[PDB]
Amino acid sequence: SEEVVIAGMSGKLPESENLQEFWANLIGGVDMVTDDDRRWKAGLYGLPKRSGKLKDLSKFDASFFGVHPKQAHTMDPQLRLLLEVSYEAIVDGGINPASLRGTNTGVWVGVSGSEASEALSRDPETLLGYSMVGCQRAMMANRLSFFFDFKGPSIALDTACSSSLLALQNAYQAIRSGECPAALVGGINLLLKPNTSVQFMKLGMLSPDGTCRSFDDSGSGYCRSEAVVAVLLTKKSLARRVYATILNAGTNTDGSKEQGVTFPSGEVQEQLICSLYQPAGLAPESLEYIEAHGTGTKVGDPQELNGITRSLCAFRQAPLLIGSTKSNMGHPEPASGLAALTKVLLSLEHGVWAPNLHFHNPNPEIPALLDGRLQVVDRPLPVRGGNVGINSFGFGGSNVHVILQPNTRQAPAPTAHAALPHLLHASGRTLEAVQDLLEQGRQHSQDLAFVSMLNDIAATPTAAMPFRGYTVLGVEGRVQEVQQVSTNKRPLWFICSGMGTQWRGMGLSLMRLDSFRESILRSDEAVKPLGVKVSDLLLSTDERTFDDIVHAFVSLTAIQIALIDLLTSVGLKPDGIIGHSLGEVACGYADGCLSQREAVLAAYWRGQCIKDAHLPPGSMAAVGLSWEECKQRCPAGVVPACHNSEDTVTISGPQAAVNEFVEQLKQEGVFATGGLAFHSYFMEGIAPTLLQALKKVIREPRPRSARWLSTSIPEAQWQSSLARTSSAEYNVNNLVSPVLFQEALWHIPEHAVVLEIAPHALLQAVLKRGVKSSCTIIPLMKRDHKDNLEFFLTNLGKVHLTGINVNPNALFPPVEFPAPRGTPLISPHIKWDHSQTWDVPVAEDFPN
Amino acid sequence: SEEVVIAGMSGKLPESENLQEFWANLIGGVDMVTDDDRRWKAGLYGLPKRSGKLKDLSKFDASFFGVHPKQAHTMDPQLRLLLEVSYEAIVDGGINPASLRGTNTGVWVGVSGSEASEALSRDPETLLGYSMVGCQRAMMANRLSFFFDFKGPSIALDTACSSSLLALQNAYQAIRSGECPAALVGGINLLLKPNTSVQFMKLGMLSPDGTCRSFDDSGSGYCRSEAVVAVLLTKKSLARRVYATILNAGTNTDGSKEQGVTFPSGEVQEQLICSLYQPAGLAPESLEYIEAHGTGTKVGDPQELNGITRSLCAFRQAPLLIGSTKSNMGHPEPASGLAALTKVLLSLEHGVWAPNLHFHNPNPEIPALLDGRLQVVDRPLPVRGGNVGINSFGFGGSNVHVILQPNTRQAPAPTAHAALPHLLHASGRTLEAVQDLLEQGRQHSQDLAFVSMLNDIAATPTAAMPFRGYTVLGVEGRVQEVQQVSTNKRPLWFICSGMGTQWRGMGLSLMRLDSFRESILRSDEAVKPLGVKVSDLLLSTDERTFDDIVHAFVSLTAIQIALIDLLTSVGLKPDGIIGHSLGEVACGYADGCLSQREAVLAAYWRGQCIKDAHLPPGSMAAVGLSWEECKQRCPAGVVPACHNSEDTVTISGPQAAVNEFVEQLKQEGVFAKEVRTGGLAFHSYFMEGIAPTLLQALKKVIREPRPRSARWLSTSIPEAQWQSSLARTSSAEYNVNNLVSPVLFQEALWHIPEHAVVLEIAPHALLQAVLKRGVKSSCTIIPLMKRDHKDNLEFFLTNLGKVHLTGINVNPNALFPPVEFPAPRGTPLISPHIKWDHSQTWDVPVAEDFPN
Ligand SMILES: CC(C)(COP(=O)(O)OP(=O)(O)OC[C@H]1O[C@@H](n2cnc3c(N)ncnc32)[C@H](O)[C@@H]1OP(=O)(O)O)[C@@H](O)C(=O)NCCC(=O)NCCS
């Protein structure tokens, strides 16, 4: 009531294009403060040459954010960057942004400077109205709320250095209280305007060396720095990834102080800390590490650390580890808190505290550094376990402290079926975007949570993310396609194929998959009282198992049902359905006419009734002749049985006549079963005995829907009493009547996606010829493929490639969240279309 | 679940130097939008000539706020003005700011613009570091928190037009939750930089006519305006004044909208409203009036009002009254919400809704205006009763709504309490500041709550408010002084006087005062078993009552105790204490040595033991001779008895010798007059006769001798022996010693420090004369009662006033029965009578300080 977690993060920091580059610099002891001329000539107005600066301000994937180019060029680069970082942070947490649209999710952005607004409003003659909508401080929050459709609070707040952590704290209370299910929290700072650094210099706040020497005797001021950081908070119930749980957080203010408004009151800071620990059941003994503000100033460092000594150290046996991210990258003013937060969370996730720079000699006014009660993290130390504190104190006296509980959940042990292959989808703005996400999958193909999260974020509108891809994890090579999509809503068609598609040990492969095996085990309950188990048949090693015509009819249709069950579980419902032979039983299941039990028995009795009449030897053959031209040339006894295409027709009749009429047909160069002759007169013998058996199984005939196109009954009689329902009468009719397949294939619309639901994809050949050029035709199993699970997965991948959304996670047992600690970061692999590049204000745009 | 009230308010609005001028303009239908050149040449860059502007930005009482002049000149005028308005708002609510120092009181300021910061940071070569501390947006909140010592949150927030009402809403939740006992909420906007108006113009947001034609068909944009407003919220338990109770408030945000980020979503606004009424037990039927955002834009007016129609009108039988303060003064952007709030609260307080301007033809896209379900307040209508809604919606989509319950408490009946005089104090920055507050008191002298509040806020540090004053209400003429104070902490001395101070029906007057009467009735219980009641003695008509030496001793000391009890109840604890004669008994009470019972019996037995010995006729006389010169010239049997001053000494002895030594002393031209003593010779050998009989009686009354403190200076025992066994405690032994030993009074009066305040605690102020001569020139000497004054209550009050005049804080409210708060509705505003020292004028950025 209610637990609040840090779910996702991203950022741009000095010399750090994303949080991965940031971690690299932290743990590697790189100093991200630089002295180049990026923002203004170094030395200008006597300023320090050193400051923390972002690599680039010019990039922004404008069309993704609905920004036309004339506006993009007049947005605060703070905002352009924050839009990307905010998206990065939401998907970092395994969360599809669509899941939060329309919700009362809040946005709080800590921000102290609107230097671009100043620049872009300097000339009345030429300025643009829309510059306000891209630059005014309120918009730093409001444009986020607008893009993401977050209808909770949308506030830009300024408390100077504490602004971003105060934003965290405000968001935290909104979630704890119930106001908000989640919150996007931002911190931003840019160094565009030199006059600002001069004001700070003249106040005595900036060190000339341009260095935050956190805790050192040598410390003589702070280094100004840039940062764009965002973090997603959610209530625990919505989280996938969880970096940490926020145990507590508050703010107070120094109030009145004899020494002046910018003198930090260590006593009041201490007061804030004290109010948040022991009074809330949280012991200072529980802390492992505290991230101090640590700007490295003569006055403020001792105030702060001595305050820590009195509020926390005094109630502890063990030394308290202390650090400050500012030693590494300088001080990004209002973004300081979230910048530091990312250091803490990256440190926790990697198991190692990233060390401070510039700590050579403890400040002698700070007893606890000299007696070892505080221990500066000055080389990488391993994370021993414990809660974490964060200070962020602004120069006007606004103080904030937050207490974190790191997530320590470990990966599950691999089970019997983590050995399986998995499927990974991706969407993206560019080819590289998709390539990178897929590569990350390949590199962490065993991290079930990581893959589960990547799959959740892949289902996106095709307008927004026009590139898709898939790869199959857990198999020999790089099995991968990636391609651009066009935004046609591509309609989905199921084709259930007939006999001929059986084979030796089919579905031995897919029985490994728990989801498939369950649809087989449910088909077992339909045929247990009749002394047969489909599960045994599929798992059988016996060469001859499927020779028996009941073993074949039941196994063929039980596999079609399992394939339909999987396809359903991943979110595919068909726009149209078409059968061939025995496939019309499976179509009935796909249409909601037959239950599972009904359809499996309609295959058993269809097979049992034919086996028991020990009929004469018959034969069929596909032949290269049209429909009307088969009736012409067919010897007596042989009839055209299935209208596959304009060129292919399958004929049916007695073995004698058919084997002869085929050898005489090859001798004129023309294209040319179980010893049975389906869809001929031969089965009118079965008609009455079947009708009776299947009247006992299909008691309550349910209507066929518009989506299912019949192949047992021509278009002409679609309206009839027979065609209304999937009755026992409908089924018998299918057996004797011809299969009018090419008849239905005319109806398939442009750009459709056609799925051949069968244990072997026999009709691939026919469907290409029968269906429009645009349409893509996708098999699901192939006969004697080394591994059909791989095959199935690879072809689901091809469906995702079309623009239809597919979520593979339902194929495998669901992952238990929160994700384990150490689950790889997602934010750094979200890549944008930066073909771009956009205007950025420059020093000469401001007064001198 | 803690009730949150709006306790106090102040502001500067267009053409309106305070909320009274603002109310005058509202109810009078004055248009505060003007077209002069104050900020920039009107018309510049094609801008509207019209905007709402403050009369002045140049004033600020810098030293009061601890701002040195070099910094004052480089502060955002927003902040300078906000500091004054914030102070004004706290004291408006009857609340002394000192009562909130050190507390977790929060500060939230809605603010969208830092145009002064831009100006003051334009030249690197010459700019000041201090400019940041006076101009950066965070400081608009942080400097308030610094000055007032408010240690809760200190946040400057920007949601464009909704910022100040969002600040109200955030503060509201902090108080409701327990985070904060109170909160200062500000809203600020200035029009310094023309380029900003150009940006707004180019976005299509500003009407050319420079007018918010709220709800009119004609409406084509908004008028930009300035405003500095602040409001104090508290939890109910801390409030004195209560304008209204906040029943509910929330914010949401429009989110995603096809039409663009600055298109207002009436549907989402509706959603916000819906979430705050029926789900919280608040019925739309309960509203009387809703203050709409009402910027007067083609698109936004219908979105808003139709949203109101669907969220509220649809659940109402009666028409809903609607208005917008923006018709009156334009739109002050982030300060819009609190500006509108003051309209609502002023309207409520005066009993009349201030009408909109510029409403001629209803916007035809708004059905509810045409069918009468919404009724624009376009002429002044009386307030019939009901809850009030306020909308404030920012152009980036941040929406806020607050629901108010107006305060309707009425003044109690004057009833069976027949009207006493009261005392009214005031502090201020200038003479006028004090004169005005006192005048307001005089004009509302029967509003008990108003007076009680004015008294609470008068107690201030003397460094900060160097002028004080008082008046006595409820009496014949104008009893008033006002004067400047010096910042010496002036120490407070009590002088308990001796005999001679009795008189016929003394304290008949002060028995009206409940607190005094009770200290008499407690002195009655000490002497009921001995067949005497002091209350009867004071109320007695018998001319001779106080001739009897026990009637006098007990009544004199019982009144001294009651005066000490009053002085205590108004907050005065003495820095030093000094007795004379029988006064050393009362000193014991004032020092915490004697209980009330102990001290009243130590007067009874001191008097009864002298009455019993019917000793020889004796006499005393004050004489014009120094201490050592009396031992020289005194005939044997006469001794110098009391050392009153360097000039006056009272001699004591047998009637024979003293009457002769007085006629021989006038024949050498020396001052010499008899003292009326009951024919007795105090502080002579004559009382060694009483010594044993008293010591025994007083050992039965003072069972457990308690130590005298450093504060009490003895007059029965010289300085030299202050360390002794006798002087440790206020024992029976100490008391007997006083009777026989001389009274060493001028001895103690040397010790009284410079600039002290000396109170003669006696039923008549006999020693006034003596104390002036005995004590340093600086020191001020104040009586408390005077013999045969027409009315001693008036006198007492007038002299408490004179104590307040010195810089020592006195709170008269405890003398009278406590006022029940919240104050009644209509209690006069305080904010407009808080006047500052505006002698200095300060820099204000100008249009030329920005780019062109
Ligand atoms: C300082 C002092 C000289 C001033 O005396 P004062 O100004 O004449 O004061 P008084 O109380 O006498 O009052 C003034 C007038 O009212 C008269 N009066 C009215 N009511 C009176 C009353 N109840 N008792 C005595 N006199 C009274 C006086 O006779 C006097 O008359 P005058 O104006 O014609 O001279 C003198 O009060 C003094 O020294 N008192 C201290 C005596 C002392 O030390 N001990 C006494 C007992 S231990």
Output the DSSP codes for B264-322: --HHHHHHHHHHHSGGGT--GGGEEEEE------TTHHHHHHHHHHHHTGGG-SSPEEE
What is the rounded distance in angstroms from the CA atom of residue A53 to the CA atom of residue B376? 55
Q: Whose CA is nearest to atom 12 of ligand 1?
A: B675
Kindly state whether residues A130 and A247 are assigned to the same domain: yes
State CA A416 to chain mean position distance: 25
Q: Which residues of B touch A401 (CB under 8 A)?
A: none
Token pair belonging to B456: 């609470």
> Cα(B674) to centroid of ligand 1, in Å?
9
Of B136, B851, B76, B811, nearest to B456 by C-alpha is: B811
Kindly state whether residues B802 and B832 are assigned to the same domain: no
Instruction: Output the DSSP codes for A751-792.
Output: T-EEEEESSS-TTHHHHHHHS-SS-EEEES--TT-S-HHHHH
In angstroms, this model's resolution equals 2.9
CATH code for the domain in which residue B752 is found? 3.40.366.10
Q: Which residues of A touch B143 (CB under 8 A)?
A: 261, 396
Q: Which residues of A touch B114 (CB under 8 A)?
A: 114
Of B505, B506, B558, B513, nearest to B533 by C-alpha is: B558
- CB contact at 8 A, B83 and B147: yes
State CA B58 to chain mean position distance: 28
Taking an 8 Å cut-off on Cβ atoms, the answer to whether B143 and A202 are in contact is no
Check whether the bond before B367 is cis (ω within 30° of 0).
no
Task: Give the amino acid at A822.
Answer: G
The kind and range of the H/E element at B201 are: helix B194-202
Experimental method: X-ray
Q: Which residue of A has its CA nearest to B131?
A: A199
Q: Which residues of A touch B399 (CB under 8 A)?
A: none
Taking an 8 Å cut-off on Cβ atoms, the answer to whether B196 and A130 are in contact is no
Check whether the bond before A2 is cis (ω within 30° of 0).
yes
Q: Whose CA is nearest to atom 3 of ligand 1?
A: B622
Find where tokens 């007085």 sit.
Answer: B662
Kindly state whether residues A147 and A296 are assigned to the same domain: yes
- CB contact at 8 A, B556 and B629: no
Find where tokens 């305050």 sit.
Answer: A307
Taking an 8 Å cut-off on Cβ atoms, the answer to whether A157 and B157 are in contact is yes
- Residue A648 annotated as part of some ligand binding site: yes
- SS3 of A550, please? helix
Kindly state whether residues A459 and A599 are assigned to the same domain: no
Taking an 8 Å cut-off on Cβ atoms, the answer to whether A124 and B45 are in contact is yes
- SS3 of A644, please? coil
Of A182, A178, A185, nearest to A156 by C-alpha is: A185
* Neighbour tally for B68: CB within 10 Å: 10
Please give the number of the atom of ligand 1 that sits closest to the Cα of B622. Answer: 39
- CB contact at 8 A, B183 and B175: yes
β-strand A648-654 against A639-643: which pairing, if any?
antiparallel
Token pair belonging to B366: 């708004």
CA torsion through residues A769, A770, A771, A777, sign: negative
User: Does any ligand 1 atom lie closer than 6 A to the CB of residue B766?
Assistant: yes
Token pair belonging to B101: 């120092």
- CB contact at 8 A, B135 and B116: yes
Kindly state whether residues B290 and B145 are assigned to the same domain: yes
User: Phi and psi of B426, rounded to 5°?
Assistant: -150, 145
CA distance B108 to chain A (A): 10
User: Does any ligand 1 atom lie closer than 6 A to the CB of residue B679?
Assistant: no
- SS3 of A384, please? coil
Taking an 8 Å cut-off on Cβ atoms, the answer to whether A138 and B151 are in contact is no
Task: Give the amino acid at A120.
Answer: L
Going across the sheet that includes B780-783, the strands are: B712-713, B576-579, B492-496, B757-761, B780-783
> Cα(B504) to centroid of ligand 1, in Å?
15
User: Phi and psi of B473, rounded to 5°?
Assistant: -90, 155
- SS3 of B848, please? helix
User: Does any ligand 1 atom lie closer than 6 A to the CB of residue B582?
Assistant: no
CATH code for the domain in which residue B645 is found? 3.30.70.250
Of B294, B343, B298, B386, nearest to B19 by C-alpha is: B343
Of B376, B343, B436, nearest to B13 by C-alpha is: B343
Taking an 8 Å cut-off on Cβ atoms, the answer to whether A136 and B160 are in contact is yes
Farthest CA pair distance, chain B: 115
Kindly state whether residues B596 and B611 are assigned to the same domain: yes
Of B60, B35, B327, B303, nearest to B191 by C-alpha is: B35
Q: Which residue of A has its CA nearest to B201?
A: A129
Non-local CB neighbours of A147 within 8 Å, separated by 6+ positions: A65, A66, A83, B256
Q: Pick from B131, B253, B257, B270 the residue to mutate for testing the A interface (most A CBs within 10 Å).
A: B253
Give rounded-to-5 percent helix, strand, coil for chain B: 40, 20, 45
DSSP-derived letter for residue A438 is H
Give, in order, the Cα–Cα distances in Å from B332 to each of A799, B205, B343, B654: 56, 13, 14, 88
Q: Is A783 exposed, middle or buried (0-12, 13-18, 19+ CB in 10 A)?
A: middle
Non-local CB neighbours of A536 within 8 Å, separated by 6+ positions: none
In terms of residue numbers, what domain contains B506?
Answer: 488-616+743-788
What is the rounded distance in angstroms from the CA atom of residue A109 to the CA atom of residue A630? 76
Token pair belonging to A167: 């934003």
HSE of A104, CA atoms in CB hemisphere, 13 A: 17
- SS3 of A60, please? coil
What region does A700 belong to: left with phi over 0, alpha with psi -120 to 50, or beta? beta
β-strand B398-406 against B320-323: which pairing, if any?
unpaired
Kindly state whether residues B136 and B274 are assigned to the same domain: yes
Kindly state whether residues A606 and A496 are assigned to the same domain: yes
Q: Whose CA is nearest to atom 38 of ligand 1?
A: B622
- SS3 of A30, please? coil
Q: Which residues of B touch A255 (CB under 8 A)?
A: 101-102, 145-146, 148-151
Kindly state whether residues B451 and B407 are assigned to the same domain: no
Token pair belonging to B620: 């005393």
What is the rounded distance in angstroms from the CA atom of residue B325 to the CA atom of residue B348? 14
Going across the sheet that includes B422-428, the strands are: B422-428, B467-473, B480-484
- CB contact at 8 A, B260 and B203: no
Check whether the bond before B822 is cis (ω within 30° of 0).
yes
Of A674, A690, A685, nearest to A606 by C-alpha is: A690
Of A653, A761, A752, nearest to A709 by C-alpha is: A752
Non-local CB neighbours of B627 within 8 Å, separated by 6+ positions: B640, B643, B649, B746
Taking an 8 Å cut-off on Cβ atoms, the answer to whether A203 and B253 are in contact is no
Task: Give the amino acid at A39.
Answer: R
Domain total for chain B? 5
What is the rounded distance in angstroms from the CA atom of residue A528 to the CA atom of residue A521? 10
Give, in order, the Cα–Cα distances in Å from A815 to each of A46, A89, A448, A819: 58, 21, 7, 8
Q: Which residue of B has its CA nearest to A151?
A: B253
State CA A337 to chain mean position distance: 28
**Long-range contact set of residues A541-545: C-beta below 8 Å, sequence gap at least 24:** A541/A505, A543/A504, A545/A504
User: Which stretches does DSSP call E strand in B81-226?
Assistant: 106-111, 154-158, 182-189
Final residue belonging to a domain, choices A627, A648, A678: A678
Q: Pick from B70, B109, B130, B159 the residue to mutate for testing the A interface (most A CBs within 10 Å).
A: B159
Pocket test for ligand 1, best of B556, B630, B648, B771 (most atoms within 8 A of CB): B648
Of A111, A89, A669, A246, nearest to B114 by C-alpha is: A111
Find where tokens 């341009």 sit.
Answer: A210
Kindly state whether residues B169 and B129 are assigned to the same domain: yes
Kindly state whether residues A304 and A387 are assigned to the same domain: yes
Kindly state whether residues A323 and A241 are assigned to the same domain: yes
DSSP-derived letter for residue B171 is H
- Residue A647 annotated as part of some ligand binding site: yes
